[model samples]
Target chain A: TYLSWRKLQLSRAKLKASSKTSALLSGFAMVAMVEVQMLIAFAICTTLLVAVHMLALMISTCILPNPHERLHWYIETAWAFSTLLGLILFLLEIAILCWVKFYDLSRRAAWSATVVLIPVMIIFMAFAIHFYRSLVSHKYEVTVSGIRELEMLKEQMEQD
Target chain B: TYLSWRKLQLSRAKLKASSKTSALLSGFAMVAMVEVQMLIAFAICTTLLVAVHMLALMISTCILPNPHERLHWYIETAWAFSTLLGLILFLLEIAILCWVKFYDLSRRAAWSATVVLIPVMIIFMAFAIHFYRSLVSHKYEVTVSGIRELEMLKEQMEQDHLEHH
Candidate 1:
């Protein structure tokens, strides 16, 4: 009886394996179908990502505990979010260029998305570059500059 | 002359200080605009994220190096990618709710986007839940079992630690 139960478990494990493969294959099939849908899919998705990306930028900016501070929790959070968005969009753009062929969809819609996206892409690039430069330089504006004021005052007192 | 340079730097620093507040204000303004855009903005963004979330799930599964392995580099890579994708999409979703009002955009277009996204959204939820549960508990068919080879052995030999250096 125990042996039979053990066999049953083994066979069930085998069944699970086959199903996993099927799911994987189907996932890839969807990827292929997405290619057939072309820019209609890409265009709509671009709108979706851009809209959210805009919101992501906004929230990141809004959450700054210290807007003037360079290395902040919120800025780090924003940079991470922006970077991931940039990557996903960049991958999708490559898909458009390679798998998604511009000619396949309505030329008008494709060009329109492309045109609007030019600024979107530029902004993403600027955001990423600016973020990296700040992160690299570790130069955040001082949250309070009263120290300099005090220093100037003390220097004048010494002169007097 | 040096004092003039000091004054220039001081003035520039003040400018930086002032501009920071304006940037903070503008950030809030955009946040407010996004709120006015409201549910229509929120719904479309939700659907958008759900779709990508599903895609992320699928891609993560398809890239698994070996299902049974305890640890693998590719698995770590997939996990990292999936995690980052999840977080960004999740944050963007919140931004949609609180920050993306879509006030300036067309109401009709928002609805159009929302309506088109509904089916996509439903399908994505199903995909993520289904994929994750199955993938998590999924036990692959054991091609080679230890018992099989052991059964093939003519006899079992017990080796004691008879000799040690």
Candidate 2:
């Protein structure tokens, strides 16, 4: 029951985070779609990005208040879609937006925007990997310690 | 202690939310500042917007992991700054960006952008007010019910004591 409660809390938190992110990013995507003169790649990217974000937003919001009985996979899918895939698309959108804005002005400007964003993308991927691994390891440690404590309690009861 | 723990969790969530919002918005502001040919109004709006977001970001990030002993006022300030003031500036920035982008192209284009945005701004404000009020009322109800439960437990204890005597 404790584990289930914890799982529910975690799912609730994830749903909240994903919903907020998807809504904001999708809003930005829509604004950018309207504001920018669309090149073919830009048009495709923005359209797909908005769709992905909105889908994630819908899923998260639907399950948010009633996260307890819902499947964990759906919550995880929303989280991954919004934060992982949605963010990658957002980064691409920004890079392409820069090109669309500045390509006619100067080739150097377009190149600089792409160059600047490449490192940011790399850093984002690195941080995501590191954070996930650390979280898993921490959970593993907690579980192991809990099992050890329970075993000790069982031994003490037998002796009594 | 339970109330304190709940408070800490709420503060932590606020800090996390503010930090993400400020960082993303500030990044967009910087990118737009660089990409757009800035008018005086646009320049001022973007700069001020970036500064406000960064300050909120810094405050939230600093207190996020260790929110237990921190002052609640700072968290609330960050929440207001990032979500309230910062979002308002973001809307202004978007409107001005649209103007800057389309004003030279067509007068009607700029006006259209502003006209479209006005309703969004109004909706944002309405939602903010409605959500805040509902949250406050819900908290008040919870606190009241908690106190009633405690009173009931005390009464039951007193009746038990009398019967024992």
C-alpha RMSD values across all candidates: 23.8, 15.1
TM-score of each: 0.24, 0.45
List clashing residue pairs in candidate 2. none
Relative to the true structure, candidate 1 has a C-alpha RMSD (angstroms) of 23.8
Best by TM-score: 2
Model 1 lDDT, residue A94, Cα: 50
lDDT of 2 by residue, B44-130 (tens): 465456545544543442342221122344345435634675787799998888887887798798888889888879977876676
Q: Report lDDT (Cα) of residue B48, candidate 1.
A: 54
Per-model DockQ against the true two-chain complex: 0.02, 0.02
- Backbone clash pairs for candidate 1 read B34-B99, B34-B100, B34-B101, B35-B101, B37-B101, B37-B102, B38-B101
In order, the Cα lDDT scores of the candidates are: 0.40, 0.58
Off by over 4 Å in 2: A1-7, A61-78, A126-160, B1-11, B23-165
Model 2 DockQ class: incorrect
